Write a protein that binds this DNA or RNA. Structure first.
Lengths: 137, 48, 54, 264, 113, 134, 191, 293
RNA sequence: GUUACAGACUUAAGCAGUGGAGCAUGUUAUUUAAUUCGAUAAUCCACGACUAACCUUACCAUAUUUUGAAUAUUAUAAUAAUUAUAAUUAUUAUAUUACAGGCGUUACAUUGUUGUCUUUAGUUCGUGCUGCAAAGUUUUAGAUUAAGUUCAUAAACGAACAAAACUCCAUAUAUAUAAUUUUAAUUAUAUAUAAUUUUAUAUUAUUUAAUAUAAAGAAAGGAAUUAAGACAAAUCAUAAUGAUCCUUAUAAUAUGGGUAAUAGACGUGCUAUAAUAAAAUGAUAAUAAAAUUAUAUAAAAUAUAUUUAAUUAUAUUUAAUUAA
């Protein structure tokens, strides 16, 4: 032989989605579906429509775009990576929400952190795996 | 050029009883002796 | 041992159906990215989009 | 005694254990100022019985010593034994370092059980000067075991209002302080790094602040009220600063949505 | 008399003829640096008359080579090498690797990160 | 059975801290080493030293580490197509001293020194207050 | 649990008691360990360090960092024997090991522990006389590898002979040792 | 569940010179003095007793331990009955020139080099095989001729014949079992209270724990190589390795403890050094590596 | 110009390029007083060099030095001195000798460390056994892995350096710390756990593996480590050392010169040849990580180039910071 996540005093779920290098902290709350990225309007922050679409996707896999107010706060990285981190956080704060439907949430992959990052400069190649010219004759 | 070391040897004005041996110096001396023996030492310096 | 509300269940059932929605369009993407060059994806997507607009 | 070795005569009437190492004290503390004595040798003769070494052999070690030991050996050499087969009980040098760390930890635990509580006592009730009545805070630089030149730097940070200048004088001080005064924080901060000892640098800042106070509290030459306060430095500084002035909307704050307290 | 114009102690540790030359310049410039600064301020302050200034610019040109730091090159204190000389350890592309890998340099090993 | 007279168990227990009545700082202790071990350890003895010294100390706030790096060739001659990177992380720990008195804080610094560790460096900026002219 | 001085005087050292008075004076009634996590500052064991243990604690009168004595009033005269011998009994004997022509002595011992042949016979009543000591070699791809074939006849000049061969790539004598082995192993009575 | 501070080595130990100085440029100067100091100390390992013998005191590389409070430069020393007692000999006198000799001694003059408290602390050893560096040293100095040509069979054998082929697997298993038993005992005592330190882990004291927890101690496998001009008849090289035992700790293979790397390039248990000495044939380098579990 | 496998940027794709131009380079050929020296297939050619005005520097011209950079000896005289100008020791000062020195030659005399086959999976050791022996077996009939990985069978039984694993960065969570003014709590670390993923069904096969499906989780990478041997590969210019060659010159110094010279040739880059692309401009300053700063960074402004202003480049004065 031989912790449970809950809403805050103001009844909202906050999650820190992480990608590239961003720590997109996101306050998701039950009020009618409006967005505020980093203290300004969504179309003003993310100019590329794809980033916006990506952000929406966690709310789009559920039928809850329009249901949840979202207050995102990003830092670090570039715009697409920031948008992706925001999207992720929505999936991490959705952890507190739809408990059973969270199975689908982790499925679509919205709760899978993207290790996809920047490789280091190999101490010999021009960049990482970009070998400089090799001669012969 | 921070000046403040005890160049190996240094050791013979303070600690007197102890008969120390500088190994590298001894080796050099032995080599010199060998050179002298086999005719391959070194011509004298013109004392000009 | 906490439970899923009907509100929640409704959807689990409700959503259960509708497939997970498409995050991308294939033809478009292959093509939008077969135009892209130096990680110049936005300039690339603009192109297809506008052409398709006309 | 500690200096008893210097008196080999006083080594008389000492237990074999005693003179024993005191002989050594002499040999350990007079590398070349060692002076031979009959009483010193007589002490060795008394320690001869115990240790079972002939009075002659010990006297020979007192004189010939190493040569005398070789004479007792009869020229006998130490058959090379250095390379001894694994026999356990040996303390590996790495393991010895681990023991040293353990002993160091014991010493630290000893300090925690003695130098911390026993050496210290009830904390002294601080005076605690009120900042409104006692501003003009001073910052001093010091490095332990380091001669870092920054140690000579002295920093004086005091809010212009804390000094107590009045409107006209308050504005003039800020105009005189210029970059040193940060309007966003309303604090006037300056540093001294021009003299060897920091003490001189501290006096320098005191004089500079006193000078500024005197000039600011006297608009006979110029009130400087017409002069607009320069904040360009703080504007650039604020650009460097990265803060979040946006908070979750209060209308978006919904307590009814938040779950109520759940009793256990 | 002394090989160098002015008598100098010998650099502790590894000694090299090139190191001796550099060390000689270091010792001389260290003391002359104050004079170097004084006279250069002289020559460069327009607020002065041309002659006083010129007299000075000239003396400088006359000042011996050892009275310069541009002439002092960073040289490995252990191997007497003036190429690829990191100044954090005052060593060189090899003695560093060697000392760092051997552990002679405390807190200096390999960037496995 | 023989218990653990406070001081005894105190070592086993976590360092006891104190209150900051007026939130008035006096000095800081940015211990720095290339090794985490002695740092956190020495730090505990400091945090402890203070409790008995009655000097409300804060936590060894872990300030960021410094990743100094240097790449060199790994050969004696030519053969540069292959190279190695070296690094020297400098760890840092902060033990701000809060409400206290102008003298006592000398001991913490003085005593903490007479029993220093190996590889740990201490810097103590003292923040004093007075009038607005002497 | 601050105890009473009398009982404290009955269980701990003496002139180290004032410290315990100052110990109970400051420390409070906190029972929450609230440790800083992996402090690793406190020792793995416990029993109060009131007593200095050799080896485990630093030598009482020895120059070491944290000597806390003075560079003068030390007490380490004579430096021949290890300053701190191991504690407890003394041996680190890995539990399972026993405190530990000569070429022939081993050749025999091994076979004694193995075949059962008596050691004495092999070391005193046999003579190994090498017959062929050549240097064969193999054409490994990793470079022509050499070796040392050796036929060393050992026998008691009474009525027992054995021809043993051998082979090594390191030393010829190493192969001869092996060959003594293969022969003492292959002794055969000669009518 | 945690590597006892005693078990894992300190990263400080990995660095030969242990010192940290906010005045970085200054610290460079500090270390510089250390190595040169090491050389001077080294040269002072020679001995004389009247054209009789030179008892080379073998010394480990200065483990300089600099820490504000004071300096604690330390090195392990090694050398070769009813006589050494009533008269101290060279080695003991060397201890004297270090710290025991009031002011005329070394540590004293040494202070004028580091502006702090210089305390030398040598450590004696009884097995030239205990310290990898020392091992190479003795082999590179005393032996010499005994191998200048071939490796005297018995000399080689004696070299291969030191530790009793300590079974690392068995040693690892016993050590691992001991750690589990100690943890289980503490766990049970804690549970007895979980349902004062006295009961917090009684039966665990300076006896069943302080030494059973020590890991590196048994020279499981040792390899010594004579590389360089060590052939009187062959000008060419003559690298001769003496691989013995194994070079892996099985404790890490199946236990919470995980192998750490000194200077993040060589495992802590693996210690190795080569003492380059010039033979009459030509300079050589004897690399000696010890697994030491 | 061999049957069959497998591996990787090896090839086929695909994208960006080199060869074509100008320039910057390193080199060959050549010149010169010298263009120091070394590498020259793959592993030389932005390579030793992480920076050549002088210095570095090694080279050439011109002058100049001879116990010189030491160590050890032989003597004379100035300097601190434990006492009290009464003994004395060292510093040396002048010299003498063996020498001190050499980037002089030999990497085909060596050390040390690298390169390539090489993330390749191989190479050995003790005992045992077969063959007279070289050798074979271990190091596997058969499957399987990325891997001499792993199972079974097996004259082999174990073991070793490797493989793998631990390791470092990085990722998920959790604890502790930060009085949230060093503020980045979306962080920084110290620690702990975590996965070399697992569970279940259905086809196949043969006692239980693969392919699909779902379901649980965050689950995903990079680095370091490149074995033995061989190429007598590279280094005697990182250092060090043998042997051999010079000591009034192949040793040391100052000034100037050279390494930057150019018919041609090569390699590597840079900048290029314009619209599925280039340039002004964007002050509620769209958005970063890593890194530096007591052999210092150098902010605001202030003056000019210039008329506004901004930008850009210099000059004046140094605020603050010696670093969350």
């Amino acid at each position: 032989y031989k912790k449970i996540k809950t809403l805050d005093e103001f009844g909202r779920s906050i999650a820190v989605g992480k990608r590239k290098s961003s720590t997109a902290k996101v306050f998701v709350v039950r009020g009618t579906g409006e967005i505020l990225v980093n203290g300004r309007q969504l179309n003003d922050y993310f100019l590329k429509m794809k980033d916006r679409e990506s952000i929406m996707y966690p709310l789009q896999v559920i039928e809850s775009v329009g249901k949840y107010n979202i207050f995102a706060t990003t830092s670090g990285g570039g715009p697409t990576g920031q948008a992706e981190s925001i999207m992720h956080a929505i999936a991490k704060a959705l952890v507190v929400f739809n408990p059973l439907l969270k199975s689908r949430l982790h499925k679509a992959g919205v709760l899978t952190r993207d290790y996809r990052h920047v490789e280091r400069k190999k101490p010999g190649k021009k960049k990482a795996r970009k070998m400089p010219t090799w001669v012969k004759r | 050029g921070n000046p403040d070391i005890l160049k190996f040897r240094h050791l013979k004005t303070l600690y007197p009883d102890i008969e120390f041996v500088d190994l590298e110096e001894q080796y050099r001396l032995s080599m010199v002796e060998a050179k002298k023996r086999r005719g391959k030492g070194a011509p004298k310096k013109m004392k000009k | 041992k906490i439970k899923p509300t009907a509100e929640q269940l409704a959807q689990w059932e409700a959503l259960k159906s509708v497939p997970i929605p498409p995050r991308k369009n294939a033809t478009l993407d292959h093509i939008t990215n077969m135009i892209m060059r130096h990680g110049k994806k936005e300039k690339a997507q603009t192109i297809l989009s506008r052409a398709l607009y006309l | 005694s500690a200096d008893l070795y210097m008196h080999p005569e006083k080594w008389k009437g000492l237990p074999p254990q005693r003179i024993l190492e005191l002989y050594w004290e002499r040999m350990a503390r007079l590398g070349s100022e060692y002076k031979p004595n009959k009483d010193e040798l007589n002490a060795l003769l008394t320690t001869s019985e115990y240790s079972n070494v002939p009075v002659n052999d010990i006297k020979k070690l007192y004189h010939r010593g190493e040569q005398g030991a070789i004479d007792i050996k009869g020229g006998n050499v130490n058959r090379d034994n250095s390379l001894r087969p694994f026999m356990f009980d040996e303390l590996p040098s790495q393991a010895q370092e681990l023991v040293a760390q353990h002993r160091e930890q014991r010493f630290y635990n000893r300090l925690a059980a003695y130098e911390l509580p026993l050496l210290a006592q009830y904390r002294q009730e601080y005076k605690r000067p009120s900042p409104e009545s006692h501003p003009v805070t001073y910052r001093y630089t010091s490095y332990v075991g380091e001669e870092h030149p920054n140690s000579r730097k002295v920093v004086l940070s005091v809010k212009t209002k804390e000094l107590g200048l009045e409107e006209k004088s308050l504005h003039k001080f800020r105009i005189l302080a210029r970059s040193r005064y940060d309007h966003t924080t309303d604090i006037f901060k300056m540093s001294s790094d021009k003299f060897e000892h920091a003490s001189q640098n501290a006096r320098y800042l005191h004089d500079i602040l006193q000078r500024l106070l005197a000039e600011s509290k006297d608009l006979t030459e110029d009130d400087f009220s017409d002069v607009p306060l320069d904040t360009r430095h703080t504007i650039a500084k604020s650009l460097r600063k990265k803060k979040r002035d946006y908070e979750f909307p209060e209308h978006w704050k919904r307590p009814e949505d938040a779950p109520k307290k759940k009793f256990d | 008399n002394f090989r160098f114009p002015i008598k100098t102690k010998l650099p502790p540790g590894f000694i090299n003829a090139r190191i001796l030359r550099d060390n000689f310049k270091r010792q001389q410039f260290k003391e002359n640096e104050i004079l170097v600064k004084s006279l250069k301020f002289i020559a460069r302050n327009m607020n002065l008359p041309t002659k006083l200034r010129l007299e000075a610019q000239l003396k400088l040109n006359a000042l011996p080579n050892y009275m310069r730091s541009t002439q002092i090159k960073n040289r490995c204190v252990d191997s007497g090498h003036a190429r690829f000389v990191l100044s954090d350890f005052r060593l060189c592309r090899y003695q560093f690797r060697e000392n760092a890998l051997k552990g002679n340099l405390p807190g200096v090993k390999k960037g496995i990160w | 059975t023989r218990p653990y007279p406070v001081n005894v168990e105190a070592v086993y227990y976590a360092p006891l801290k104190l209150p900051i009545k007026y939130g008035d700082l006096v000095a800081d202790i940015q211990l720095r080493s290339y090794d985490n071990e002695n740092l956190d350890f020495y730090s505990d003895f400091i945090l402890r030293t203070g409790y008995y010294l009655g000097i409300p100390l804060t936590g060894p706030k872990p300030l960021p580490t410094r990743r100094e790096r240097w790449t060199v060739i790994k050969s004696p001659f030519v053969h540069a197509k292959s190279k190695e990177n070296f690094e020297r992380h400098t760890h840092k720990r902060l033990i701000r001293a809060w409400d206290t008195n102008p003298e006592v804080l000398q001991m913490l610094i003085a005593y903490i020194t007479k029993h220093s560790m190996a590889g740990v460096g201490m810097k103590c900026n003292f923040f004093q207050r007075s009038e607005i002219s002497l | 649990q601050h105890y009473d001085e009398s009982l404290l005087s009955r269980y701990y050292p003496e002139s180290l008691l004032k410290s315990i008075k100052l110990a109970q004076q400051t420390i409070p009634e906190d029972t929450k360990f609230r440790v800083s996590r992996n402090v690793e500052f406190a020792p793995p064991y416990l029993d109060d360090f009131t007593k200095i243990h050799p080896f485990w604690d630093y030598k009482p009168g020895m120059p070491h960092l944290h000597a806390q004595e003075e560079n003068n009033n030390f007490s380490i005269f004579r430096w021949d024997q290890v300053q701190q011998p191991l504690p407890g009994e003394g041996n680190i004997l890995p539990p399972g090991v026993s405190l530990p022509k000569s070429k022939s002595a081993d050749v025999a011992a091994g076979l004694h522990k193995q075949t059962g042949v008596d050691p004495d016979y092999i070391t005193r009543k046999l003579t190994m006389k090498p017959l062929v000591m050549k240097r064969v070699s193999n054409q490994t791809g990793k470079g022509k590898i050499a070796s040392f074939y050796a036929l060393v006849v050992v026998g008691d000049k009474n009525g027992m002979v054995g021809l043993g061969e051998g082979k090594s790539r390191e030393e010829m004598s190493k192969a001869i040792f092996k060959a003594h082995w293969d022969a003492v192993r292959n002794l055969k009575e000669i009518p | 569940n945690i590597n006892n501070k005693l078990q894992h080595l300190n990263n400080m130990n990995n660095w030969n010179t242990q010192i940290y100085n906010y005045n970085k440029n200054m610290e460079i100067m500090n270390t510089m003095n250390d190595k040169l100091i090491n050389k001077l100390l080294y040269k002072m390992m020679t001995l004389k007793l009247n054209n009789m013998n030179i008892n080379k005191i073998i010394m480990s590389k200065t483990i300089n331990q600099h820490s504000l409070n004071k300096l604690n430069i330390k090195f392990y020393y090694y050398n070769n009955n009813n006589n050494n007692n009533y008269y101290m000999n060279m080695m003991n006198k060397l201890m004297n020139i270090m710290n025991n000799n009031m002011n005329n001694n070394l540590c004293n003059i040494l202070s004028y080099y580091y502006k702090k408290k210089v305390t030398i602390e040598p450590i004696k050893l009884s097995y030239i095989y205990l310290n990898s560096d020392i091992f190479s040293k003795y082999i590179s100095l005393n032996d010499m001729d005994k191998y200048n040509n071939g490796i005297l069979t018995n000399y080689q054998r004696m070299l291969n014949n030191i530790m009793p082929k300590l079974n690392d697997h068995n040693i690892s298993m016993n050590y691992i079992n001991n750690i589990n038993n100690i943890n289980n005992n503490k766990y049970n005592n804690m549970i007895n209270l979980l349902n004062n330190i006295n009961n917090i882990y009684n039966n665990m004291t300076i006896d069943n724990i302080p030494m059973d927890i020590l890991m590196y101690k048994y020279l499981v496998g040792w390899s010594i190589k004579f590389k360089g001009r060590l052939s009187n008849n062959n000008g060419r090289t003559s690298t001769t390795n003496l691989l013995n035992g194994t070079f892996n700790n099985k404790k890490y293979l199946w236990s919470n403890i995980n192998n750490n790397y000194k200077l993040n390039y060589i495992p802590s248990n693996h210690n190795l050094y080569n003492n380059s000495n010039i033979n009459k044939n030509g300079k050589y380098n004897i690399k000696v590596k010890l697994n030491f579990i």
